[PDB]
Symmetry: D2
Subunit: 375 residues, 4 copies
C-alpha cells in the first residue's frame, strides 16, 4: 500500500477488546495482576503503546518510545553514553539539543564535537577513540544544510558508532533514516507529527533490539514519559500527516518560485533549489520537502516590516503548525550569539524563517508577495 | 486558616480571565507574542503553573515544579550535581530512586554513599569533601524508618550540602520539610497527592531562589514536564487530600491496634508505635501518619493466603490510592536481592505491606482480621 | 459492607481487558463488528456505561442513564409522557425543572399541576384521570421543604403513576428513593456527585425494566448523552462522595448551631432542626443531611454585606462544590418573581442561601459569624 | 481568502488572555461573578463558544449551537414547534431523524408529512395551514437524492415556514444553505466535521436573530449541550476539513469511474453522474461532492463477499471517518422495513454503501476493483 493508506491502517490504533476504532485513553497509573508471580521486581500504558507502535511503523523500525518532549527524547538518547564518551554533531545544531548537551551533559563528562557534516569526510576526521555517537539533523535549522544519511550510517557502522538522526523537519512521510542504516531516528513530535500546536512530545524509533532495550531502561529509570492524553492527540494528529505535508509541499514550491523572483529578496535557503548544497543528496534520501524556508531581506527593519505586513504568517518560534509561522532568527533563536559570529555563520540580520502551514497556496504566495512589495 | 481550608483556597487555581472556578486545561504548545521583543532567545503552561503554585503553597515554599513522574523529579534534582560530586542517601532507599542513581547517574560520575540516617551522626561520618547533596526519605520503604529532618537540615547547612526530602509517604498535609530547613522537598504525586491511581507525576518545591533557577534550567533543558491534562487531574485530586489522609489515618490507628493483638502477626512497623525507632522524632516533625504499614506473618504461604483471603485489600505494588492495596516485598519489590541479604535487612518472607485506602474503617479492620484468622 | 467501602468497590469501574484500576476513556464514536449480523438496524460507550453502573449501584437500582445535564435528565424523564398527560410536582419547584416544564413541555400538551407535597393528601386531591407522573424534590430549594417519599410512592403505585424523585440535594449517600418504592430517581450530577465544579451532567436510576427500556429509547432518540471525558470525571469525583458529604455534614451541624444563636439571624431553614416541618419524616427516609442551608438576615443590604464580609463563602449560584458558596435567592434565582409573591412564598429580601463545602469546620463557622457580627 | 485559509484563520479559536494558539478546554461548571447584579435570574463555556463560532463562520451564519449529538441538534430544532404544527420532510429520511420525529415528537402532537422533495412542487402541494417547518436533507441517504435548496428556501419564505437543511453529507466546505436563503443549517458533526470517529456532536447555525434566541432558550431549557473536551476535539478536527474533503473527492471521482465500468456493478448513485436526477441542481448549489456512494451488486451474497474481499473498506455503519467504510443498507439501516417495500424504494438486496476515507486513491480504487473481480 501507498503512504496515505499506511498512515490510516498501519500500527495498532484500534481496541481489540471492544472494537473501538480509536485507541482508548488509559488515564490510569496501576494495573491489577491476577497472581503474585506476574509482579516481577513503567507498566505499558496502552495509549502510549499505540503511539509508539505508530512511530515504529511509520519509520520501518521495530521499537517506538514516547517522551514528554523532543528534548526529553534527545536527552534519553544521549544518556546511552557514559562520562568520557564523545558525540559528533552537525555544527549548526542549536536550540534545545545544543543547550542540553553543552549546559547539562558536559557536566556529566560527555564530550561534544561539532562538525560540518555536509562533508562526511569531516566526520571521519573528527572520529576519536572515545567517540561513541554520531548525531545528525538534516536538513538543519535555520539554513537547511543537508547531510548524506546513508554515508553517515556507513561511517558509523565502520567505526562502531551509534548513529542518530533528528528527522523532525522531514517527518517519516518523506525521509526514513532507519531504511538507510541509521540506528536511531527521533522527532520533536510537537511539530509536524502532532501537527496542531497542541501536544508537546518526543518520539524515538529503532530496529536494534539491544539499543531498544537500553532505551527502555533509560526511559523507565529517568521517567520522561508521554502522558496518555497527549499520546492520544498525537496519534490523532498523525492521521492527517500525509495530507498536511502534501499541502505544505505544494505551497513550498510555489512560495519558493515567488521568492527567487522578488526584488526585495536576496538568498533563499531550501533543499529543493538545484544550487543548494547537497541538493542531489537530499533528493536521493527523501521524496519530498520540509515546510521550513529561510530567505534574506535587506536588514532588520525590512524583516520586522515583512512580519507586520503579512496577513497569514504569524509571528512565533515553533514550526509544523496548521498555521503558517514567521520568525527572524537573529532577533529570536540566535540573538544571544554576538552579531559578528552570527554574520559569519549565515544568520544575517535580514534572515527570515517561515514555516509553511496548510492555508490555501494562492493566499500564502500572494500575502508574502504583497508584504515583500511593501519594501 | 486551618489545613482543610488551605487545600481549597490556597494557590492560584481559578481563571482570572473568565472567573472559572477550576483552572482551564491549556492543551497547547505555542503562545502568540504581541511584538518581536517578547521572544528573547518551555513557555509556562498555565495548567502546569497552577499545579506548581499548589505544591509550593502546600509546602510553604516559593517555587514549584511538575515532572512527568516522580522518577523524573528525582532525576532532575540529581542533575543539580556534576561528575565527581557525592550524594548521601538513607541506606534502605530502593526502587526508582536507587535504580536511577546506581544504574544511570553513576555512569555520569555521580557517586552515591548509602547511610543509615536514623542516626544523624552517620551522616556526619559519611560527609566527604566531594559531598554536595543529602537526600532523605522519611519514613522509608517498606520498614518505615524515621530520620530527624531538622537535624539533617542543620548538618546540611553547616557542611554546604543541598538537602532534599522525599515527602511522598507523609504528603504536605502532615509533614513540611521546608519549614524545618530543608532546601528541596519532592513527591511522587502519583501516590497520595493525585490520590486516584490515574496520574503519573512528580512534584518539587523549594524556597531557594537560586536552586529554583537551576531546577527551571534543568527542567527546560531535559524536558521531563508534566502535561496539562495530568496537571489538571493532579490539582483536582489534591482538593480532597485532607479528607482522604484523615480517613486513612483513622483506619491506620484501628488497623494497627488489630495487628498488634493478633496471634498470626509478629512484628509491626509503623512510626505511630511507641517502641518504633525515632517515634519521638516523627511526632516532633509531623502531625499525622502515613497510610503504609508493614507487618510479619509467619512465612511466604501465610502471606499469599492473607492476600487471597482479603475482600478489600487489592494486590498491587503502588500506594496512596482510594483502594487499599496489599503486597509482599520479598516476592515483589525486593525479589532480586538474594534471600539472605533480604533476611539480614528485615525483608523476611512473611513481611506484608499494606497501603490503607479510604474504605470504611470497620470494613478494613474486619476484613484483614478475618483473613489473618484463616492462618 | 458499609457505605464508604461501597463507594470504592461498587459498580464496574475497572478494565477487564488490561486490569487498569480506573475505567478507560473511550473517546470514540464507532465500534467495529466482527460480522454483519451484529449490526441489527447509541452503541454503549464503556466510559458512560461505567458511570451508569455506579449510579445504579449507589441507588440500589438496576439501570443507570447519564445525560449531558440534569436538565437533560429531567427532560428525558418527562418525555415518558404524551400530550394530554398530567404531572404533579411539588409547588416550590423552580429553576431548570420549572422552566423546562412550563416553557417547553406545556407547548407539547403536557400539563403541570403544582402541589404542596409536604402533605401527601394534597397529592391525592390533585390526582386527575389524566395524571401519569408524580415528580418530587426533597428537600426542595431554597427553603428545604421535606416530602414523605414512602407515602408518595404508595399513592403513586395505587393510582398508577410513575413516581420520580430529584435526589440531588441528599445524594445516594444519605437517601435512597428506590428503596422506598419510587420508580425513578435522578440527579444533577453537576452538584455533589461530581463534587468539583467541573462536570455538567445528569444521572437517572431505576429498577423497572420497562421504564428503563423506554428511557433508553428516549435517550437514543433525542441524544442528550454524557460524553466519555465527563463520564470519567464523574466516576472519579464520586469516589470521594462519602468523605465530602461527611465533612459537609459536620460543618452543617456546627454552622446551624451558630446561626440559631446569632442576634442578626432570624429564621433558619434546614431539615435537621426539630421545629422544621416534617423533620421526623426526613429522619425516617434519610440518614444524613444536605449541605444547603437558608437563613434570614434583616434586609437586602445586610445580605449583601454578609456576602462581602465572608472570607470563605463565595458568591455563586450553584451548590455541591468543594468550596462553600453563598447566594441571595431574591436577587438571583427568584428576582423575576414580583416582590410581593416572593414575600408571600418565603423568599424575603434578607433570605440567604449557603452551600457548605469541605473547608475546615471551625473556619466556616468563625467566618460566617464574624461576617454576621459586622451587622 | 480562499476556503483552506478560512478553515485555519476563521472564527475565534485562540486565547486572548494568554495568546495560546489553540482554545483552552474549560472543564468547569461555574464562573465567579464580581458583583451580585451580574447574576440576573448555561453560562457560555468558552470552549463550546469557540466551536459555535467556527460553525457560524464556516456556514456564513451569525449564531452557532453545539449539541451532544446530531440527534440532539435535530431534536432541539423540532422543539421550535408546538403541538398541532406540521413539518414537511424529504420522504427518504430515515435513521435518527425519522425515529425521533415518528416515535417521540408525534407523541407531542407534532405532525410529520413526508414528501419527495426532488420536485419542489411536491412541497407546495403538501403545504397545509398548520405547516410551520420545511426540513430537507440533501443529498439524502442512502441513494443521494438531490433537492433544490434555493427553490425550497423561496417556497418556505413565501409560505412562512422555517426552512432547515441537514448539511452533514456535503459539510460547509462544499455547500452553504444559509447563502441560499435557508433559515437553519445543521450537522451531525460526528461525521466529516470532527472527521476522526472520536466525537459525538451536533452543530446548528443560523443568521436569524429571533430563531437564534429561541434555539438558545431551547438549548438552555432541555440541556443537550456539547461538553468542553468534545468541543475542543471538534475544532481540532475541523482544522483539516478542507484537506480531508479534497482527498475524499479525488478518490470519489476515480472510484465512480471504476464502478461505472465494472461488469459486477449495475446502478451507481452519486450526484456527480450526469444521468443522476437533479445533477444540474447539485452543481448549482455545491462546488464539490459527498464521499458517500451507493451502488448495486447482484444480490446479498455478492454484497457480503465484497465486504469480505476488501482490504481497506471497513464494515461499519457511520461515515466521514479517515478510514473508508462499507455497509449494506438492506441488512443494516433498513433491515426492519419489509423486503418488498425496500425493493420498491430502491433498497435492493445488492445495494452497497461506501464512505470514502482519506487513504491513497489508487489503493481504494484497486482494492474495491479486486474485490468486485472476485464476483
Ligand atoms: C533542537 C530542538 N529540539 C526541540 C526543541 C523544542 O521541541 P520540544 O518542545 O518538543 O521539546 C527545540 C526548541 O528550541 C530545539 O531547538
Ligand atoms: C523511589 C521510587 N520513586 C518513585 C517510584 C514510582 O513513582 P512514579 O510512578 O511517579 O515514577 C518508585 C517505584 O518503584 C520508587 O521506588
Ligand atoms: C431544578 C434545576 N435542575 C438543574 C439545574 C442545573 O443543573 P444542570 O447544570 O446539571 O443542568 C438547575 C439550575 O437552575 C435547576 O434549577
Ligand atoms: C438522520 C441521522 N442523524 C444522525 C445520526 C447519528 O448521528 P449522531 O451520532 O451525531 O447522533 C443518524 C444515525 O442513524 C441518523 O440516521
Ligand atoms: Na541497521
Ligand atoms: Na532554608
Ligand atoms: Na418498585
Ligand atoms: Na435568510
Amino acid at each position: 500500500s501507498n503512504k496515505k493508506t499506511k498512515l490510516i491502517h498501519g500500527g495498532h490504533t484500534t481496541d481489540d477488546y471492544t472494537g473501538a476504532v480509536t485507541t482508548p485513553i488509559y488515564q490510569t497509573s496501576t494495573y491489577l495482576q491476577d497472581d503474585i508471580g506476574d509482579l516481577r521486581q513503567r507498566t505499558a500504558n496502552p495509549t502510549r503503546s499505540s503511539v509508539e507502535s505508530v512511530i515504529a511503523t511509520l519509520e520501518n523500525g521495530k521499537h517506538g518510545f514516547a517522551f514528554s518532549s523532543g528534548v526529553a527524547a534527545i536527552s534519553a538518547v544521549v544518556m546511552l553514553l557514559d562520562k568520557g564518551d564523545h558525540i559528533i554533531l552537525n555544527s549548526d545544531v542549536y536550540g534545545g539539543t545544543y543547550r542540553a548537551l553543552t549546559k547539562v551533559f558536559t557536566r556529566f563528562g560527555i564530550e561534544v564535537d561539532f562538525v560540518d557534516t555536509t562533508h562526511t569526510d569531516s566526520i571521519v576526521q573528527a572520529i576519536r577513540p572515545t567517540t561513541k555517537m554520531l548525531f545528525i539533523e538534516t536538513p538543519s535549522n535555520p539554513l537547511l544544510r543537508v547531510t548524506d544519511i546513508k554515508k553517515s550510517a556507513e561511517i558509523a557502522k565502520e567505526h562502531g558508532l551509534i548513529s542518530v538522526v533528528d528527522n523532525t523537519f522531514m517527518t517519516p512521510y518523506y525521509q526514513n533514516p532507519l531504511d538507510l542504516g541509521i540506528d536511531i531516528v527521533l522527532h520533536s513530535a510537537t511539530k509536524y507529527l502532532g501537527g496542531h500546536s497542541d501536544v508537546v512530545a518526543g518520539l524515538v524509533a529503532t530496529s536494534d533490539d539491544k539499543l531498544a532495550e537500553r532505551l527502555a531502561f533509560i526511559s523507565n529509570s529517568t521517567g520522561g514519559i508521554l502522558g496518555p492524553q497527549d499520546s492520544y492527540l498525537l496519534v490523532r494528529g498523525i492521521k492527517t500527516l500525509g495530507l498536511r505535508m502534501e499541502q505544505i509541499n505544494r505551497s513550498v514550491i510555489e512560495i519558493i518560485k515567488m521568492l527567487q523572483a522578488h526584488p526585495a529578496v536576496q538568498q533563499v535557503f531550501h533543499p529543493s533549489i538545484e544550487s543548494h548544497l547537497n541538493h542531489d543528496v537530499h533528493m536521493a534520501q527523501a521524496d519530498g520537502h520540509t515546510g521550513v524556508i529561510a530567505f534574506e531581506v535587506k536588514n532588520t527593519e525590512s524583516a520586522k516590516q515583512l512580519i507586520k505586513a503579512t496577513s497569514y504568517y504569524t509571528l512565533a518560534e515553533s514550526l509544523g503548525a496548521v498555521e503558517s509561522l514567521i520568525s527572524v532568527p537573529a532577533l529570536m533563536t540566535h540573538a544571544s550569539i554576538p552579531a559578528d559570529i552570527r554574520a559569519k555563520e549565515g544568520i544575517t540580520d535580514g534572515l527570515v524563517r517561515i514555516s509553511v502551514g496548510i492555508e490555501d497556496t494562492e493566499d500564502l504566495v500572494d500575502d508574502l508577495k504583497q508584504a515583500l512589495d511593501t519594501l
